[PDB]
């Protein structure tokens, strides 16, 4: 079936400017207290989450170097230490990961 007539610019304006087809405004945008960048209420902050993932990559890069190959997963717990820190008694017999930089303020 083919169109029997051309549709006019007036009719076309009514189809594509209908309120059903317009972009809706958002009411759930807020500012992040820690960084001051914007976020949605039900979603994690992107800027703050970006910090954590960067550190996570560094730790995992170090973990890869120590193991030296695949199929080398330890059977004991893991822990991370930064320069100026030494293992406690409770830390005995647990894999230790060493980072050159100092302990990040946010990391506890």
């Amino acid at each position: 079936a083919a169109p029997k007539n051309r549709r006019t610019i007036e009719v076309n304006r009514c189809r594509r400017r209908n309120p059903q087809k317009l972009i809706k405004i958002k009411n759930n945008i807020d500012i992040c207290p820690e960084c001051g960048h914007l976020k949605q209420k039900h979603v994690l902050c992107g800027y703050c989450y970006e910090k954590v993932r960067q550190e996570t990559t560094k730790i995992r890069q170090q973990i890869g170097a120590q193991e030296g190959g695949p199929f080398r997963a330890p059977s004991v717990e893991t822990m991370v230490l930064y320069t100026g820190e030494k293992p406690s008694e409770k830390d005995q017999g647990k894999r230790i990961v060493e980072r050159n930089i100092k302990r990040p303020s946010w990391f506890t």
Partner: protein
């Protein structure tokens, strides 16, 4: 009609769905924090919880060992489950995982994203949301109300 169907349709079929979930579960055990699409991580969350239940049964149980063998493709991780993760969650009765929604992926498909992890890991803490302190204006008024009712019978 899909009344009462508790599974999503994923992959190339029923068998393909299991294999996709198995790969995500194996990655979670090794790394303990993972990013997937929100729908896929939500489907895999259930299996992650039940795996910690078989681990609790113990190394010597024949059924537990068979189940662990199937669901962990890399075999260096079966010792980890029975001797690291299972001891960690001895006290709790559940709620071993934490899952949160992440900003949409910036890769031209704009997928809804999530991050799923096991509680108690060694990684830097996630930036979770905190409730308001009791020092705020609304909290104080409710605290005042609580004290009066408690003290006055």
């Amino acid at each position: 009609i899909s009344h009462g169907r508790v599974y999503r349709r994923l992959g190339l079929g029923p068998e393909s769905r299991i294999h996709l979930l198995r790969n995500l579960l194996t990655g979670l055990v090794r790394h303990e924090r993972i990013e997937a699409t929100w729908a896929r991580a939500d489907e895999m969350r259930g299996y992650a919880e039940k795996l910690i239940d078989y681990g609790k049964l113990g190394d010597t149980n024949e059924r537990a060992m068979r189940m662990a063998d199937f669901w962990l493709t890399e075999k260096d991780l079966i010792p980890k489950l029975f001797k690291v993760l299972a001891p960690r969650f001895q006290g709790q009765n559940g709620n071993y995982t934490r899952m949160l929604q992440i900003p949409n992926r910036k890769e031209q498909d704009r997928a809804k994203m999530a991050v799923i992890e096991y509680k108690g890991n060694y990684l830097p803490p996630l930036p979770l949301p905190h409730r308001d302190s009791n020092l705020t204006l609304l909290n104080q008024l409710l605290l005042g109300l609580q004290q009066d009712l408690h003290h006055n019978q």
